[PDB]
DNA sequence: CCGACAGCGCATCAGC
DNA sequence: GCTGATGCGC
DNA sequence: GTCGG
């Protein structure tokens, strides 16, 4: 709360730019400024003081000046009381409903969850699911449940074929006490960079009633919903399964471990050290992909190997 | 003044 | 029928 | 929106 007023303002502005203005880069810019200010071990007294921090420019400095001089931001106060802007912003909290669909819905007088429920025919499959589990999808998953979820995935995966390898990634692998969802990386000897693997795994997870719904499903990427077996019922949870080639495991596990800001900074720094890095390979006009552990990637771009727990940014 | 800020996989829409 | 663009969520 | 070409 040292600079909580400021960081709250910037985060709120960020969401507006993403959900209403449809400006993801302004969203990212506001998020970046909020993040650096949250690390600043001082009580900010002026916009010029905040201006010194990387990610804080002239506009945010001006906004901070107004906030420190009035206790509020007129632009934000007006946004909050705007019915269409607030409705658009809220509807995007439904999975499957982005800035475009939210705006279209609000233009049609559809502004609430109640409105969505009585207009189900106007929703696609993904949106219907996002609406059905609206509350559950905004719940956090305690690591203990993540462990129980991991146990089921790992057990059923081997039950299909012992050659499969499944690894839970993302926040869980970064050792978070709670996660927003579950991210699973899957590999098999049959699928390499040069040469129904995902389908069989998904089918088995459905057979034991772990997976309850499907948002999207192709040959390499699954997005769906899962639930632990009950005793009170556990909330439904979001789960992704990604099938990547086995000879590209290290780049894959690195990317899906994250975090998103961390990956964003790794891509940037790689570009400086004369590298380009994706979820598949890392290349030196680019060259041929290099042989790879995770530390190897850090070594190419000249970085000390940070454990997953230190990859928040 | 002005473009990058990564871009992928899947569902769905737009159009031949 | 198809290819490509767009929206969406990573 | 900020940064840097
Ligand atoms: N815009 C994004 C979103 C995600 N990721 C990567 C890093 C993440 O770790 C991983 C999985 O995405 P999640 O949304 O699940 O993020 P987390 O698992 O890290 O956190 P959460 O607990 O909210 O699920 O994909 C990325 O590179 N860029
Ligand atoms: Mg996750
Ligand atoms: Na600055
Ligand atoms: Na949404
Ligand atoms: Na996820």
Structure description:
The PDB classes it as transferase/dna. This protein is globular. The protein is α+β, with helices and mostly antiparallel strands and 313 residues long. It has helices at 4-19, 24-39, 47-51, 58-70, 74-80, 83-91, 99-107, 113-117, 125-132, 134-137, 143-160, 170-173, 197-207, 249-257, 260-272, 294-300; strands spanning 141-142, 165-168, 178-179, 182-187, 211-217, 221-226, 237-243, 276-277, 282-283. The chain has a 5-stranded mixed beta sheet with strand order 2-4-7-6-5, sandwiched between helices. Strands 1-3 form a two-stranded antiparallel sheet. The longest helix has 18 residues, at 143-160. It has 4 domains: 1-82, DNA polymerase beta, N-terminal domain-like (DNA polymerase, domain 1, Orthogonal Bundle); 83-139, 5' to 3' exonuclease, C-terminal subdomain (DNA polymerase, domain 1, Orthogonal Bundle), CATH 1.10.150; 140-255, Beta Polymerase, domain 2; 256-312, Beta Polymerase, domain 3 (2-Layer Sandwich). It binds 2'-deoxycytidine-5'-triphosphate (DCP), magnesium ion and sodium ion (3 copies). One sodium ion is lined by residues 170, 181, 183, 240. One sodium ion is lined by residues 92, 94-95, 97-98. The chain binds 3 DNA strands through residues 17, 23-30, 32-33, 54-60, 95-101, 124-126, 183, 215-221, 223, 240, 242, 260, 263-264, 267-268, 276-279.
């Amino acid at each position: 709360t040292l600079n909580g007023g400021i960081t709250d303002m910037l985060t709120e502005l960020a969401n507006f730019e993403k959900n209403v203005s449809q400006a993801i880069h302004k969203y990212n810019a506001y998020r970046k400024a909020a993040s650096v200010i949250a690390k600043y071990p001082h009580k900010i007294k002026s916009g010029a003081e905040a201006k010194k921090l990387p990610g804080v420019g002239t506009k945010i400095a001006e906004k901070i000046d107004e906030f420190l001089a009035t206790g509020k931001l007129r632009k934000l106060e007006k946004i909050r009381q705007d019915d269409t802007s607030s409705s658009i912003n809220f509807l995007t909290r439904v999975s499957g409903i982005g800035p475009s669909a939210a705006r279209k819905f609000v233009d049609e007088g559809i502004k609430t969850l109640e409105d969505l429920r009585k207009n189900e025919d106007k929703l696609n499959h993904h949106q219907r699911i996002g609406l059905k589990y609206f509350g559950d999808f905004e719940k956090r998953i305690p690591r203990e449940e993540m462990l129980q979820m991991q146990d089921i995935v790992l057990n059923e995966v081997k039950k299909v074929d012992s050659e499969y390898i499944a690894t839970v990634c993302g926040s869980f692998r970064r050792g978070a006490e709670s996660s927003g969802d579950m991210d699973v990386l899957l590999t098999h000897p049959s699928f390499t960079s040069e040469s129904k693997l995902l389908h069989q795994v998904v089918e088995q997870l459905q057979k034991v009633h772990f997976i309850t719904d499907t948002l999207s499903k192709g040959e390499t990427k699954f997005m769906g919903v899962c639930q632990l077996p009950s005793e009170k019922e556990y909330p439904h949870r979001r789960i992704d399964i990604r099938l990547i080639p086995k000879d590209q495991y290290y780049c894959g596990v690195l990317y899906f471990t994250g975090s998103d800001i961390f990956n964003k900074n790794m891509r940037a720094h790689a570009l400086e050290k004369g590298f380009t890095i994706n979820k598949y390979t890392i290349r030196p006009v680019a060259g041929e992909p290099l042989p790879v552990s995770e530390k190897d990637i850090f070594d190419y771009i000249q970085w000390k190997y940070r454990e997953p727990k230190d990859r928040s940014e």
